[PDB]
Design a protein around this ligand. Structure first.
Ligand SMILES: [Cl-]
Ligand SMILES: [Cl-]
Lengths: 580, 580
């Protein structure tokens, strides 16, 4: 069947009573849910959906799932199983799943994502947020946004937003339009001009969902599913549309006399990703690096930059360029980076420009004449990566072309560290750390990608190309609620000790792989038998910012505070910028 | 910038002027184009298209193509490059490519595909067809069809069938509606009752194309492209809509406790395709085989057959089922089959059923107790593949379930050939060949997949799992039109002899690979050099149905005609209905 128009309200009511379901076959980023609601209010139409009608004889023939509603990046990213399996004929959605999920999360659910820089262990790193609309939206002529939608905690919404009036979008499914419009009219915090504007935005939102025929679908049973599914694919977007990424790639490879630049680019990606313990770089990175290493004026990942003259330059230099790219990954692996602990792939671009510039080869990793230069790059890269945010995000393209001029100007004197650091300061991307950034670094968690990076900056000396790991000084296994309450730790200090045992003051770098006999002893026990000479012992331990090793867990927080103090100092000096 | 109105005629005028072009980045089956036109006349709407505007300053920055128009499976199957590049702003179509191509082929172009049973080398196996509509179509209740569209020759369109009035669709782009409707009204082929419904169907077809707003699109320049493409993708089918067959795979994987069904399917498929010199088998075949080998009542490739009860039965029997499937591929390779010469992969299903029924293993290929049985299978299979069509196409599912009962009753006595052939006969699929089929077999071309099969039937005794090939008796290279006139062949006959030189009476099976010294000699020279003893030579020529080996090409047709008669007698004997 064809249904040419239903409301979003009718659609979501069916989702609510589990009459629209999913067959057993992910979710969008919050920013994309917001772009959908903005596009919806602006008037962009939905494409048609496709629904498979399940008769009651078949309720049990197949496994069905429920549309995602309250998304939690940690605790609920999988679709929930059906709980109210209908006993009348119902629907499984074959096309429309992600648009319907976003509608459902925005209007009936929530989104809890991990805060930037925090670790999965942290429980206050996943604040629950709900979709909100700023009833006083004004056209942002940069994003093309007409309505400002945003996922907000309850308190960032309720705060006095100056010039803003935030409205929880889901209220239009819970209250009548009259009650909501009256709330806005009766709010004395709005001016009369603001009240008029808030009112027509709230009406526009309410009625887009409740009055406008936005939803169209085909609806078919088992018997003719095959035929209409084919019709549906034929007449709508059947052969999937290229993303912008894949469009640039196709346009870019079109300009190459090599009969398969597509194959050259994939071989390079997979090669790069097999380096060391594995990386995860994309073809986007390779194409942008193409633009950057060929001295193209713009490194913007934009279709206009992949015209035939620029792709002619890129093809000419493809061998130097894939050589530098591949040597960039080998440098990174030689520092200990892999796919799990490299947060910003864009940092590869200036590294690769440098290696490509000086025409370096894999001997750059061994010869001693380079060791000082290799160490200067490592320190710079790690510091850039220790920033929670604000270095390799927004503003990248202008940062990259300025860093490129600095590297160009350096001839073969080596990595131009002072110049680079000044360019970054000039751009609002200083590698200077302020005291609260320092405190944040000193409480990093085991497994956070910045943690090993920080440790290899604080305690250099290992061959980071060889095996090494981060270990707990007081083994993490000793720290459970049961075990601790019997050594006497008060019941209220129990969660404090457990959280602290997993953080930087209890962390160290160790050569080799995980030692299982170290992890079953108290640290003073383990170090007394590995270092019988009491003087060696206290020099080794001191090299690791370990002064003492209390013999009972009851005194762990004394140890923690003491080493936290030493690490704060060591972090300060390590992150202090040189001068001349 | 949106545009919800647009006629198909406007769209195709832009294609015709080369103002709608393709960016550099396959064409549908003719029956899929026909189904597009049927859906279009039934009211199924087109999804919205995405167009990228190229400003005249960038008309040279990228490579563009023209929409395909006159499709030739051999001589013109990849997009035409741009003649007549617009000097004003123009469009590259980013979404809608395939739907526009189909409109363009149906309304302004043509489709030439290889006739079933013929080979690429034959220049009269690709008759040009153009899209036609039966102005007397009536609802077909078996196909959901309402309008019968079909690609036809001018000759088969000019034929009078009881209620078949074929009208060439492209004429609505070339002539005024008045002229076309008057020709229908003036045609003594139609009764007054029929000219009313033919006029109404011609008008509906004409006006769907010229008056109705069926085309809608977004149009964007470089600047808005990224933003609007992502909106387009989010609001429409954003994830590649799953085909019916990918839906079945997903439905099926979901019901397996833990054999990790998705990659056990793909792994078995890859395994199947690497047997011998390689096959090209589909996951769809593997699923169908699951249904047949587990004795499910229906073997229809329909979603209803993949409920959890059936998938439970399949998972239990998965190991014996993949065993049987791989053994069936190994048996086929032992016959000399591969991806190129196996025309009907459905023939695998009864093979695999049989092999699974008797629980045979790899020793079935070698032990001599099976030699007679393997040869009976090979003989039956080849005969089924020697039919140009009508065996493994339509009607397959009922044939399969009946072949299954025949194999199941055969117990352990061996392949039940007589009963299988009775079954095939009552299904209208006799392995009996009539005189005109015999004559067509006696002139198959070199390279036609049926030629190798026929030869292995007529000349058994090689080790078809070791290397062998088809070779010309009088080498193919001797037969160029310059070379032939020089040995003094009359002008009239020259191309009769070139023709016949590529056909079965000049073909033989030889062990090993191509022998380049044999291909440079007249046959009688080759054989006198290889078989110095004239009596062993006559014996060996006799085994290949060679009576005489004329020494001049001038007598080649005397050889052709003599060996053709010898082959006809062998073929008539090899294909004759058997003893009972
Ligand atoms: Cl940027
Ligand atoms: Cl069938």
């Amino acid at each position: 069947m064809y249904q040419a128009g239903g409301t979003i309200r009718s659609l979501l009511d069916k989702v609510a009573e589990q009459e629209y379901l999913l067959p057993a076959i992910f979710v969008w980023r919050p920013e994309q849910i917001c772009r959908l609601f903005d596009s919806l209010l602006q008037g962009y139409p939905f494409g048609t959906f496709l629904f498979w009608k399940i008769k009651p004889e078949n309720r049990d023939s197949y496994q069905f799932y429920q549309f995602m509603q309250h998304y939690h990046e940690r605790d609920n990213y999988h679709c929930e199983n059906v709980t109210q399996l209908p006993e009348r004929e119902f629907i499984a959605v074959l096309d429309g799943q992600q648009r319907i999920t976003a509608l459902n999360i925005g209007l009936r659910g929530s989104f809890a994502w991990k805060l930037t820089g925090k670790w999965w262990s942290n429980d206050d790193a996943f604040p629950v947020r709900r979709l909100h609309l700023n009833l006083l939206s004004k056209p942002d002529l940069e994003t093309g946004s007409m309505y400002d939608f945003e996922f907000l905690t309850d308190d960032k919404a309720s705060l006095d937003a100056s010039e803003q009036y935030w409205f929880r979008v889901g209220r239009i499914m819970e209250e009548e339009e009259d009650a909501l419009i009256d709330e806005v009219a009766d709010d004395a915090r709005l001016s009369s001009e603001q009240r008029k504007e808030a009112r027509s935005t709230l009406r526009h939102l309410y009625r887009t969902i409740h009055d406008k025929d936005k939803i169209s679908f085909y609806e078919e049973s088992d018997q003719s599913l095959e035929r209409v599914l084919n019709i549906f694919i034929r007449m709508n977007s059947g052969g999937t549309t290229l993303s912008y990424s894949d469009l640039l790639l196709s346009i870019a490879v079109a300009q190459w006399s090599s009969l398969d630049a597509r194959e050259e680019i994939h071989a390079l990606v997979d090669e790069m990703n097999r380096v060391g313990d594995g990386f995860n770089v994309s073809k986007d990175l390779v194409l942008k690096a193409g633009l950057m290493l060929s001295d193209i004026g713009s490194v913007g990942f934009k279709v206009e930059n992949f015209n035939k003259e620029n792709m002619a330059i890129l093809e000419k230099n493809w061998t130097p360029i894939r050589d530098a790219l591949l040597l960039s990954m080998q440098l990174l692996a030689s520092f200990g980076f892999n796919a799990q602990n490299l947060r910003a792939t864009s940092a590869i671009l200036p590294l690769a420009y440098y290696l490509h510039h000086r025409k370096l080869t894999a001997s750059y990793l061994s010869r001693v004449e380079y060791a000082v230069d290799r160490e200067c790059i490592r320190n710079w890269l790690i510091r850039s990566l220790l920033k929670a945010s604000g270095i390799w995000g927004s503003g990248l393209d202008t940062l990259l072309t300025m860093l490129r001029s600095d590297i160009k100007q350096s001839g073969d004197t080596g990595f131009p560290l002072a110049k680079i650091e000044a360019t970054m300061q000039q751009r609002g991307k200083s590698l200077r750390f302020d005291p609260e950034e320092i405190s944040e670094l000193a409480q990093l968690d085991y497994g956070n990608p910045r943690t090993f990076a920080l440790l290899t900056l604080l305690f250099p000396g290992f061959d980071f190309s060889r095996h090494f790991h981060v270990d707990h000084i007081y083994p993490k296994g000793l720290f459970t609620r049961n075990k601790l309450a019997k050594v006497g730790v008060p019941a209220e200090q129990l969660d404090e000790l457990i959280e602290a045992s997993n953080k930087l003051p209890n962390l160290q770098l160790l050569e080799g792989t995980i030692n299982n006999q170290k992890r079953q002893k108290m640290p003073h026990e383990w170090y007394a038998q590995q270092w019988p000479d009491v003087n060696a012992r206290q020099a080794h331990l001191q090299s690791q910012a370990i002064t003492s090793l209390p013999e009972q867990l009851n005194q762990f927080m004394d140890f923690y505070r003491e080493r936290q103090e030493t690490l704060l100092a060591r972090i300060r000096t390590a992150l202090q910028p040189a001068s001349s």
